[PDB]
Each structure stands twice: as structure tokens, then as C-alpha cells.
Amino acid sequence: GDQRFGDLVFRQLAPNVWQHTSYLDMPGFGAVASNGLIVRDGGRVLVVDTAWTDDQTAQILNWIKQEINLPVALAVVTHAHQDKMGGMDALHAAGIATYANALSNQLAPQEGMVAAQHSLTFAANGWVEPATAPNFGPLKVFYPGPGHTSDNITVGIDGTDIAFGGCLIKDSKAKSLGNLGDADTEHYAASARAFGAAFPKASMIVMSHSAPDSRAAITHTARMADKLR
Ligand SMILES: Cc1cc(Br)c2c(CP(=O)(O)O)cc(=O)oc2c1
Numbered sequence: 001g002d003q004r005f006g007d008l009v010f011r012q013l014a015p016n017v018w019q020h021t022s023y024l025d026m027p028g029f030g031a032v033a034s035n036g037l038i039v040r041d042g043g044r045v046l047v048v049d050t051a052w053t054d055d056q057t058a059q060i061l062n063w064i065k066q067e068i069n070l071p072v073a074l075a076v077v078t079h080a081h082q083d084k085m086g087g088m089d090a091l092h093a094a095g096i097a098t099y100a101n102a103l104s105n106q107l108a109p110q111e112g113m114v115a116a117q118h119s120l121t122f123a124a125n126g127w128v129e130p131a132t133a134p135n136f137g138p139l140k141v142f143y144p145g146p147g148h149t150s151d152n153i154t155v156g157i158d159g160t161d162i163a164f165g166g167c168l169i170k171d172s173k174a175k176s177l178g179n180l181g182d183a184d185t186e187h188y189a190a191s192a193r194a195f196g197a198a199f200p201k202a203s204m205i206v207m208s209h210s211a212p213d214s215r216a217a218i219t220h221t222a223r224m225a226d227k228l229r
Pocket residue numbers: 026029032081082083084167178179181208
């Protein structure tokens with residue numbers, strides 16, 4: 001049940017969870033879809049990842065207003081590339097509190113991104129330091145190790161069967177690991193497996209560039225990444 005809304009696509013995944021999809025015509029790579037998440041937690045909405053652009057991200061907020069009609073309490077973005085952080089200014093213009101891995105905020109200017117307002121830090125075992133992620137509700141933020149990028153983070157949704165791998169995870173039939181320009185090829189496989197181990201109950205794996213898949217997305221991604229070493 002995909003819903004076309006302007007140039008974006010929205011798909012309900014669970015009673016309180018929707019996937020947002022936006023597109024950027026990247027010369028040399030076609031019009032690339034990127035997915036994030038929208039989660040209703042009681043009387044507020046939480047967003048995972050921007051769209052590629054400010055205008056698209058404002059359209060996400062317009063869809064939220066029309067389909068949910070509750071305030072967006074915060075957004076968390078999953079690394080410092082345009083598909084995940086390109087719309088930061090639109091969130092700030094809307095008055096939404098924004099969060100990213102401290103490393104993502106440090107990298108943002110050189111990547112052409114605007115930093116989030118708040119920095120997440122992580123324990124040695126990968127779980128977010130809880131004081132840095134206040135009021136995250138059901139969102140469980142995990143740093144699995146370097147993979148697609150050194151700063152990539154992942155998000156589970158407590159109370160659902162959903163976990164979000166962002167650009168770390170590719171679908172179970174993917175032919176490649178995509179853009180490795182900023183990747184850590186030696187650690188990728190272990191990081192993919194650590195994501196799976198952090199969210200063992202998640203049977204629906206959501207990711208940046210394919211429709212939600214089974215956990216075979218994790219095993220297949222890791223198996224491809226074993227070849228990078
Ligand atoms: C060279 C290059 C750089 C990026 Br920054 C991308 C992205 C964004 P990402 O998915 O790596 O976060 C998507 C893509 O399709 O091709 C790219 C190629």
C-alpha cells in the first residue's frame with residue numbers, strides 16, 4: 001500500500017510506523033530512492049533520517065501533518081551523507097530537535113551537510129549513552145561499528161518487529177554493497193552482524209535503498225562484506 005504524495009512515497013509498516021521514500025537524480029547513478037522512518041509514540045511523532053533535500057523533508061512534515069496531525073518531537077539521522085542529513089535545515093526551520101552520532105556532526109560540514117543540534121555518544125558495546133538520547137521513546141539507537149561509513153548508526157523500534165539498518169544493510173538479493181567511497185571494508189561484515197545481534201527479535205529489516213526485507217538482508221549483506229576482506 002504505497003502512497004504517492006507529491007514526489008515522495010509513504011508506506012505503512014506497522015500500526016505506528018511508516019517508511020518515507022525520496023528520490024535524487026544523481027548524475028551517473030539514476031534517480032536513487034532513499035528510505036527513512038516515521039514513528040508515532042503516543043501524542044508525538046519521531047523521525048529517522050531526512051529526505052535528500054530540504055524541500056523534500058518539508059514535504060515529509062506536510063505528510064505527517066495531514067496523515068498523523070501530531071507534533072514531531074525529534075529526528076535522528078543515521079550518518080553524514082545527503083540521503084540521511086540533506087534536509088536538516090528543514091527540520092530546524094520547523095522547530096524540531098535533531099540528533100546524530102557525534103561523529104556525524106563533526107563530519108557534517110566537510111560533507112556539505114548541516115549538523116544536527118545534539119550529539120549522540122555510544123558505549124564501547126555500541127548502545128547509545130542514554131543521557132544523550134532523551135525522550136527517544138521506543139527508538140533504540142545502536143552503533144554497530146564502521147561499515148557503509150565510520151559513523152553509521154542503526155535504530156530498533158521497541159514494541160514492533162522492525163529494525164532500521166540505514167545504508168549499512170542491503171536487501172537479500174542485492175548484487176553489491178553500493179557506495180563504498182566512505183566505507184570501512186575490513187569491518188563491514190562484523191558491523192552488519194553486530195546490527196543483527198543487537199536486534200534479534202526484528203523480523204522486518206528496513207534499509208535505505210530497498211523495500212523492507214526479512215533478516216536474510218542481514219546475512220546476505222554480511223556474506224557479501226566477507227568478500228571485501
Ligand atoms: C559517489 C556516491 C556518493 C553517494 Br554519498 C551516493 C549515495 C548516498 P549513500 O547511499 O552512500 O548514503 C547514493 C548512491 O546511490 O550513490 C552514491 C554515490
